[PDB]
Amino acid sequence: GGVLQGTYVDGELNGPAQEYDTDGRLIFKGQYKDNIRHGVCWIYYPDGGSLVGEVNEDGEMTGEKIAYVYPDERTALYGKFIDGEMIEGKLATLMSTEEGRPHFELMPGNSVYHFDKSTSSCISTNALLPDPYESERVYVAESLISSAGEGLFSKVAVGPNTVMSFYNGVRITHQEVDSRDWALNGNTLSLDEETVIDVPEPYNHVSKYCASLGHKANHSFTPNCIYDMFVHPRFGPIKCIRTLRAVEADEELTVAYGYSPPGKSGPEAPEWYQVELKAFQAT
Ligand SMILES: C[S@@+](CC[C@H](N)C(=O)[O-])C[C@H]1O[C@@H](n2cnc3c(N)ncnc32)[C@H](O)[C@@H]1O
């Protein structure tokens, strides 16, 4: 599936090439040499992020100068990667692109980021190491909504379809979430058919966990954001918060929580939600 526009020299791929996904989105741009990815290549993710760097002998993203670039196409985690996996990335800025080749400038400080996919019990190896892309776009504060605890706010004005925050957390089964005390489900977010993401009790406090902040976004029936899929260099496959339209600086980010046909919709919706739902219906 999907098209691969290539340059061939006697049977094998040799020269520039560009690949697209079934949807016609550019997922790869670079070149091949004897049917193998060669030189500085770019891998583009559906969510807007990407991988770029001097590929190795086997055509993979393995090197000491590989980089993951966030959706703003400016914030980057530059460093050591093995076959696309971030082993030791340092915060940097993509200054410019010279003939397809990127130029990175490290940011002050030597914090190291690495692939650290959560487990059912470990949410992160550095719960208090913030996400640099998040630090630029959002902040947590008392929600403008009444009796709704903390909310998530935009630091600057941005347009529609902008990735603002990441929803990372421990990974557990739907079975476990549907069968346990529902009072423990305030932060559960369905990732897919087999995994639910949760930011369990202790970590729901910014003073204990600030690696991602998506779980701080409150609900609204007229939301300005939606939950979207995201492949993070550090968190791995998770969900993120993306704007549905332009948002002002200091505007509160909200999303419509998921509450399918009767029965096949899992646990009942919280009391606060049901209340607002009625108040909303025929507002
Ligand atoms: C995913 S958290 C969002 C952040 C949370 N308010 C906090 O301070 O950490 C979900 C919880 O926030 C509250 N919440 C979200 N949207 C709300 C709303 N519209 N009205 C009241 N409470 C809301 C309730 O306790 C709820 O279960």
Curated annotation (Swiss-Prot):
Residues 136-258 form the SET domain. GO terms for biological process: chromatin organization; DNA damage response; heterochromatin organization; peptidyl-lysine dimethylation; peptidyl-lysine monomethylation; positive regulation of DNA-templated transcription; regulation of DNA repair; response to ethanol. S-adenosyl-L-methionine binds at residues 148-150, 218-219, 276. The SET domain is necessary but not sufficient for histone methyltransferase activity. The record marks 167, 178, 188, 239, 257 as: Histone H3K4 binding. Its EC number is 2.1.1.364. One of its GO terms (molecular function) is histone H3 methyltransferase activity. Belongs to the class V-like SAM-binding methyltransferase superfamily. Histone-lysine methyltransferase family. SET7 subfamily. Keywords: Activator, Chromatin regulator, Chromosome, Methyltransferase, Nucleus, Repeat, S-adenosyl-L-methionine, Transcription, Transcription regulation, Transferase. It catalyses: L-lysyl(4)-[histone H3] + S-adenosyl-L-methionine = N(6)-methyl-L-lysyl(4)-[histone H3] + S-adenosyl-L-homocysteine + H(+); L-lysyl-[protein] + S-adenosyl-L-methionine = N(6)-methyl-L-lysyl-[protein] + S-adenosyl-L-homocysteine + H(+). MORN repeats lie at residues 28-50. Histone methyltransferase that specifically monomethylates 'Lys-4' of histone H3. H3 'Lys-4' methylation represents a specific tag for epigenetic transcriptional activation. Plays a central role in the transcriptional activation of genes such as collagenase or insulin. Recruited by IPF1/PDX-1 to the insulin promoter, leading to activate transcription. Also has methyltransferase activity toward non-histone proteins such as CGAS, p53/TP53, TAF10, and possibly TAF7 by recognizing and binding the [KR]-[STA]-K in substrate proteins. Changing residue 216 to A: Significantly reduces the catalytic activity. Widely expressed. Expressed in pancreatic islets. One of its GO terms (cellular component) is nucleoplasm. Interacts with IPF1/PDX-1. It is an enzyme of class 2 (transferase). Changing residue 167 to A: Significantly reduces the monomethyltransferase activity but increases the dimethyltransferase activity. It comes from the Eukaryota. This is Histone-lysine N-methyltransferase SETD7. It is found in: Nucleus; Chromosome.
